[PDB]
Amino acid sequence: EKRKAAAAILSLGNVLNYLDRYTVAGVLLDIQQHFGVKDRGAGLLQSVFICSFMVAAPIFGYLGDRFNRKVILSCGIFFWSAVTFSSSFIPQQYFWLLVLSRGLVGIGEASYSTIAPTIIGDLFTKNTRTLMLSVFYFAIPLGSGLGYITGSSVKQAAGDWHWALRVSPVLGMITGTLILILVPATKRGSWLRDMKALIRNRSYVFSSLATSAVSFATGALGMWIPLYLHRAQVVQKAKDSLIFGAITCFTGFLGVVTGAGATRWCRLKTQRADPLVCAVGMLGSAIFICLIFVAAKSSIVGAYICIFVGETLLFSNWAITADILMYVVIPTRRATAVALQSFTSHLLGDAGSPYLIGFISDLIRQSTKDSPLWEFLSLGYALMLCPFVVVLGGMFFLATALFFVSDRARAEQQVNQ
Numbered sequence: 001e002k003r004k005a006a007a008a009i010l011s012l013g014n015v016l017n018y019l020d021r022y023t024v025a026g027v028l029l030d031i032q033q034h035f036g037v038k039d040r041g042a043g044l045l046q047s048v049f050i051c052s053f054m055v056a057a058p059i060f061g062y063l064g065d066r067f068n069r070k071v072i073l074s075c076g077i078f079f080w081s082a083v084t085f086s087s088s089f090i091p092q093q094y095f096w097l098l099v100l101s102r103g104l105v106g107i108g109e110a111s112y113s114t115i116a117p118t119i120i121g122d123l124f125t126k127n128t129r130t131l132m133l134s135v136f137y138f139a140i141p142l143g144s145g146l147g148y149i150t151g152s153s154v155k156q157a158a159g160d161w162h163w164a165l166r167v168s169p170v171l172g173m174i175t176g177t178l179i180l181i182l183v184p185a186t187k188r189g190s191w192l193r194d195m196k197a198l199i200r201n202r203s204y205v206f207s208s209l210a211t212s213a214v215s216f217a218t219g220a221l222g223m224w225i226p227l228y229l230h231r232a233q234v235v236q237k238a239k240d241s242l243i244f245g246a247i248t249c250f251t252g253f254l255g256v257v258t259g260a261g262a263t264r265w266c267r268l269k270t271q272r273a274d275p276l277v278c279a280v281g282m283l284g285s286a287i288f289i290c291l292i293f294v295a296a297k298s299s300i301v302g303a304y305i306c307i308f309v310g311e312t313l314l315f316s317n318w319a320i321t322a323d324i325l326m327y328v329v330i331p332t333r334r335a336t337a338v339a340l341q342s343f344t345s346h347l348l349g350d351a352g353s354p355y356l357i358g359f360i361s362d363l364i365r366q367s368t369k370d371s372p373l374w375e376f377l378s379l380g381y382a383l384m385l386c387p388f389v390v391v392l393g394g395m396f397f398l399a400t401a402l403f404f405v406s407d408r409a410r411a412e413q414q415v416n417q
C-alpha cells in the first residue's frame with residue numbers, strides 16, 4: 001500500500017520525465033519557424049539537454065548517496081517543471097535562453113532518473129522488486145509517445161505551440177507534491193581501480209560501444225523523424241507525430257517482448273545468444289531505418305511501416321545489454337560499470353547526434369539550391385548516418401559475442417572466489 005503507492009507515483013513521475021524530453025521534438029517545426037533558426041539550433045536543443053543530463057547524472061548519483069534522496073528527487077521534478085513552464089514564455093529573439101532552459105531541464109531530470117530507481121529498489125525486494133522496477137521502465141516508451149502526442153495535439157488545439165510546454169508542468173507540480181507525501185524517507189540501503197579493471201574487459205568495452213551506437217541512432221531519429229516526415233508530406237503535395245508517438249509506445253513494448261522471446265529461443269543453441277541476438281536485431285533495424293528514407297520519397301505509409309519494424313528491432317536489445325553487463329562484470333564493479341557505460345553511451349551517442357544531423361543537413365543545404373524539396377532531401381541525407389551507426393553497433397555486438405564466453409567465465413571464476 002504505502003510502498004505500492006510510492007512505486008505508482010514514481011512511475012507516474014517517470015512518465016512525466018520522458019514526456020517532457022520529446023515535447024520539444026514533437027513541436028520542432030513550430031520552434032524553427034518561430035525562432036528562425038535552421039536545423040543546427042534545432043539539434044542543439046536536444047544536444048544541450050543530453051550534455052547536461054550526462055554530466056549531472058553522476059553528481060546526483062553522488063548527492064543521493066549522501067543526502068535525502070526524496071528531497072533531491074522532489075526538488076528536481078519541481079525544478080524542471082518550472083524551467084519548462086517559464087521557458088514556454090521566452091520571447092522570439094532569445095533562442096539561447098531556450099537552449100539553456102533545455103539544459104536546465106536536463107539537469108533536473110537527471111536527478112529523477114538517477115535517484116528514483118534506487119528508491120524503488122530500496123522499497124521492494126526480490127520478485128516484487130523486479131516487477132516494480134519494470135513498471136518504472138515501462139514509462140520510457142509510454143512517456144516518449146505521450147510526449148509526441150501531447151506536443152502535437154496541444155499545438156493543434158490551443159492554436160499555439162507554447163502550450164505544449166505549458167500543459168505538462170502542471171502535472172509535475174502534483175507529482176512532486178505526492179512524492180513529498182507518498183514516498184517514504186528511505187535511507188541509503190575506488191572508482192578508478194574499477195575503471196582500470198573495466199577497460200581491459202573486452203566484452204564490457206564492446207557492449208558499451210554498441211550501446212553508444214544504439215543511443216546515437218535513437219537520439220538522432222527520435223529528434224528528427226517527426227520533422228523529416230512532415231517535409232516528406234510537404235514535398236508529396238500534427239498527424240505525423242501523433243502516429244509516431246503511438247508507434248513509439250507500441251514498438252518499445254513489442255521490442256522488449258520480442259527481444260526477450262528471441263533470447264529465450266536462442267538459449268537452446270548458443271552460449272553467446274544474448275549478444276548475437278543484439279547484433280542480428282541491429283543489422284535488421286539498419287535495413288529498415290534506411291528504408292524510411294526510401295519509402296518516404298513516395299509513400300508516407302511505407303515510411304510508417306519501416307519506422308514500426310525498425311523501432312521494434314532497435315528497441316529489442318535494451319534489456320539484453322543489461323544482461324550482458326550483469327554477466328561479465330563482478331558485482332563490486334557493477335555500479336561503476338553501469339555509471340561509466342551510461343556516460344559513454346551519452347557522450348559517444350545522443351549528446352551530439354541531433355546536433356551532428358542538423359549540422360550535416362545545414363552544410364548540405366548551403367552548398368545546394370534552397371527549396372522545400374532540397375530541405376527534405378538534405379535532412380534525409382543527414383539522417384542516413386543513423387543506419388551506418390546501427391551497422392557499426394551490430395559489429396560491436398558481434399565483437400562482444402566473441403568474448404562473452406571468456407569474460408563471463410572470468411566473472412564467474414572471480415565471484416566464486
Ligand SMILES: CCCCCCCCCCCCC/C=C/[C@@H](O)[C@@H](N)COP(=O)(O)O
Nearest residue numbers: 134137138140144221222252253256311315
Ligand atoms: C526508427 C527508430 C526511432 C527511435 C525513436 C526513439 C524515441 C524515444 C523512444 C524511447 C523508447 C525506449 C524503448 C525502451 C523500452 C523499455 O525500456 C521498456 N519498454 C521496458 O519496460 P517493459 O516493457 O519491460 O515494461
